[PDB]
Design an enzyme around this catalytic site. Structure first.
Site, PDB file in Angstrom:
ATOM      1  N   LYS A  64       0.818  -1.211   0.000  1.00  0.00           N
ATOM      2  CA  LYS A  64       0.000   0.000   0.000  1.00  0.00           C
ATOM      3  C   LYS A  64       0.854   1.265   0.000  1.00  0.00           C
ATOM      4  CE  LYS A  64      -3.910  -2.081   2.382  1.00  0.00           C
ATOM      5  NZ  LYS A  64      -4.741  -1.869   1.161  1.00  0.00           N
ATOM      6  N   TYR A  65       2.148   1.108   0.251  1.00  0.00           N
ATOM      7  CA  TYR A  65       3.028   2.263   0.413  1.00  0.00           C
ATOM      8  C   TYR A  65       4.164   2.298  -0.609  1.00  0.00           C
ATOM      9  CZ  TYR A  65       0.490   2.669   4.772  1.00  0.00           C
ATOM     10  OH  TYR A  65      -0.506   2.798   5.711  1.00  0.00           O
TER      11      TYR A  65
END
Ligand SMILES: [Co+2]
Ligand SMILES: [Fe+2]
Ligand SMILES: [Fe+2]
EC number: 1.14.11.38
Lengths: 289, 285
Positions: A64-65
């Site tokens: 997600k990052y």
């Protein structure tokens, strides 16, 4: 400074007092709980994990990052210093037993590393009620089901983003949008420990230093055994599990546990027997108990 | 007075959902075909015929010897594990019911047998296994659902479950009269579904003869809540013979509470548990 500050207590401080601080202030600091050698051993073990090249497959949080995201999940499985020493610290557990007296047994939901680099902004103020969203609806007065335990592994300073805690804020109806100067700073040395009550409003301070020195933190959540561990330690090899103490095994979900009455039987069992009995689980300190 | 509504197994789920919020409970007629009921009973007969254990029995040791109980039937009764546990109507209801809280799984499923001459239970709510439930506001997303399988006839004489309709809206249990409740009289194959906070009581058994009343109770809970029974000691071969849905119900996979949980729960090494375990399943590639 001007405002009432976080109390910093010696490892041999009174547990009744610590329990009272949690209910009145919502947080406090244990000074020099972990000796420097333990801290550095832990740090080296974490360095090893962070140096591992990124995997081919899916990573639930990390994907997600951006790639510069620094994170080590479930440090208990890869960091012997945490598993054998930090996790079973007797002062931490004295506090937990007192804190969770009304709810019953507790265990480790998660313990993981974050590193906050130079030039990162502060976190928004919030409550730790997202992993188990039902916590959001639990009244203040109900028996607490979660405790946040925060381990600085580098210096926490006013400059590099020491955790910002708003004292007494667990009594608020909502988080709202509080000013930064309503909070006080958990400035700490490595080896100190920050203990934070359920519902206390707080924020990571980011890191406004410009010299390239990252701030390192391990966050551990001890929850009522009523709550499903975020991290499951069930794939730990038996040899590793049996090398731990009974307390360690209890923390990592390998034994049957007991929520408070009116649950009068327990939880995490099978065949109407204790899990550790079904598994014939040995432990390092079974001869002494 | 209003009775428990009896719905056909293929009834519209929205209606079922409506009934749970209004009445707090309803009955599905003939969900399980006769052969399923019969095989399940045969499998339970085998367990019930197994001799009383030597060592401690956590639940059973707390009650008198006439306590008849088979724990975690999913591990010993293939019919429950392969057919009943994954019934699509039950899960349609669950998915609708748990919309606000997110994923759910099986906390426990077990057999009780209630012999002749047994008194009814006191009225209560099912909030004892996870006591935090006692403090959850009425309006909060439900985190538990009771699913009750009669395996013998439930009659007014032999202890059909007593349910007080609408009582999930009460602030407390109080001291309700038996005539405030209605009876879940049912045939084997039927299913009683009961909402969180609904005041109810096992009906005991007022018969003076015959074989005991047999019931399987399943608790489906938000994955936020630790399963009472842990299925982690199931042999890998048994687990991998199950469907994905079955594995999810029995705690062998990573699950997802509602947002603001945006990662999930029951994971390891920042991976899905089934991926770390390289778990096969009956209905996955
Ligand atoms: Co009357
Ligand atoms: Fe936080
Ligand atoms: Fe009940």
């Amino acid at each position: 400074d001007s405002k009432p500050q976080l109390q910093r207590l010696a490892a041999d401080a009174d547990v009744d007092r610590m329990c009272r601080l949690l209910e009145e202030d919502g947080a406090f600091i244990l000074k020099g709980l972990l000796p420097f050698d333990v801290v550095e051993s832990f740090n080296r073990e974490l360095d090893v994990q962070m140096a591992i090249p990124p995997p081919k497959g899916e990573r639930l949080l990390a994907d997600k990052y951006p790639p510069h995201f620094k994170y080590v999940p479930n440090v208990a499985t890869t960091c012997p210093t945490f598993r054998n020493t930090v996790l079973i610290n007797p002062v931490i557990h004295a506090i937990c037993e007192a804190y969770f007296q009304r709810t019953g047994d507790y265990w480790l939901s998660a313990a993981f590393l974050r590193e906050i680099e130079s030039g990162m902004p502060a976190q928004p103020f919030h409550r730790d009620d997202a992993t188990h969203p039902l916590m959001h609806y639990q009244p203040l007065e109900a028996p607490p089901v979660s405790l946040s335990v925060i381990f600085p592994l580098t210096e926490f300073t006013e400059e590099n983003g020491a955790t910002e805690v708003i004292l007494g804020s667990h009594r608020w109806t909502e988080v709202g949008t509080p000013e930064r100067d309503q909070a006080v700073l958990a400035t700490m040395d490595p080896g100190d420990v920050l203990i934070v009550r359920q519902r206390v409003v707080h924020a990571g301070g980011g890191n406004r230093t410009t010299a390239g020195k990252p701030r390192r933190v391990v966050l551990a959540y001890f929850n009522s055994v009523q709550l499903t561990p975020f991290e499951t330690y069930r794939t730990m090899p038996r040899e590793m599990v049996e090398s731990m103490t009974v307390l360690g095994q209890r923390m990592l979900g390998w034994r049957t546990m007991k929520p408070s009455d009116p649950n009068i039987v327990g939880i995490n069992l099978i065949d109407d027997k204790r899990l550790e009995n079904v598994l014939q689980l040995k432990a390092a300190d079974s001869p002494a108990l």
